[PDB]
Amino acid sequence: AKKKSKLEIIQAILEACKSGSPKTRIMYGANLSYALTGRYIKMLMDLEIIRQEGKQYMLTKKGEELLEDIRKFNEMRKNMDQLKEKINSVLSIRQ
Amino acid sequence: AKKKSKLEIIQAILEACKSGSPKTRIMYGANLSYALTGRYIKMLMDLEIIRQEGKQYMLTKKGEELLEDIRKFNEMRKNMDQLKEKINSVLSIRQ
């Protein structure tokens, strides 16, 4: 089932950096794939989302603005599916 | 491209019935597949969405409540996609 390895686990990496935290503090977010996960942190660094604070991972202006963006989407996407379900309900689809 | 024959054209059938209107007044909504479109009116009628007013098609309590539901979804779905685009923008996907 798709839901991690890019969407959730990553969100945990961005949230862990929301205040400067080493790779270890990210485990408290989810099982650290450290062998591979380093690929996610490096990605968020290469793309400009995480920041280096004393060799620690912190959030850059881009990372905070992204945290809010992801919030709304999930807050609206769930609304869409919720609303979508309301459409099939009254519309029944085909009874 | 999917966008009618079920989502838009139908919406026009719901809006046309928003005030009792014959099958002809619905043509002003689209190229009316009248030969087949009748299948859409009956479908919405059989599912409890259209209403028969003097042989004309009107909106039933279910049809009005559905009109608003479809509005929100589309108003939130576009938000999700707009927001989604914001995610790939700052997350720059993979540059």
For chain B, list the domains and their CATH numbers: 1-95 (1.10.10.10)
CA distances, A74 to each of A78, A83, B59, B68 (Å)? 6, 14, 33, 21
- The H or E element that residue A66 is part of is helix A61-91
Tell me which chain A residues have a C-beta less than 8 angstroms from the C-beta of B83. 69, 72-73, 76-77
Contacts of B94 in chain A (CB under 8 A): 43, 47
Asked whether the beta carbons of residue A80 and residue B76 sit closer than 8 angstroms, the reply is: yes
Sorted by sequence, the CB contacts under 8 Å of residue B33 that are 6+ apart come out as: B5, B9, B40
In the Cβ-directed half-sphere of B1, how many Cα atoms lie within 13 Å? Answer: 2
Contact B62/B50 with Cβ under 8 angstroms? Answer: no
Tell which residue, B13, B12, B80, B2, has the closest CA to residue A82. B80
Method: NMR
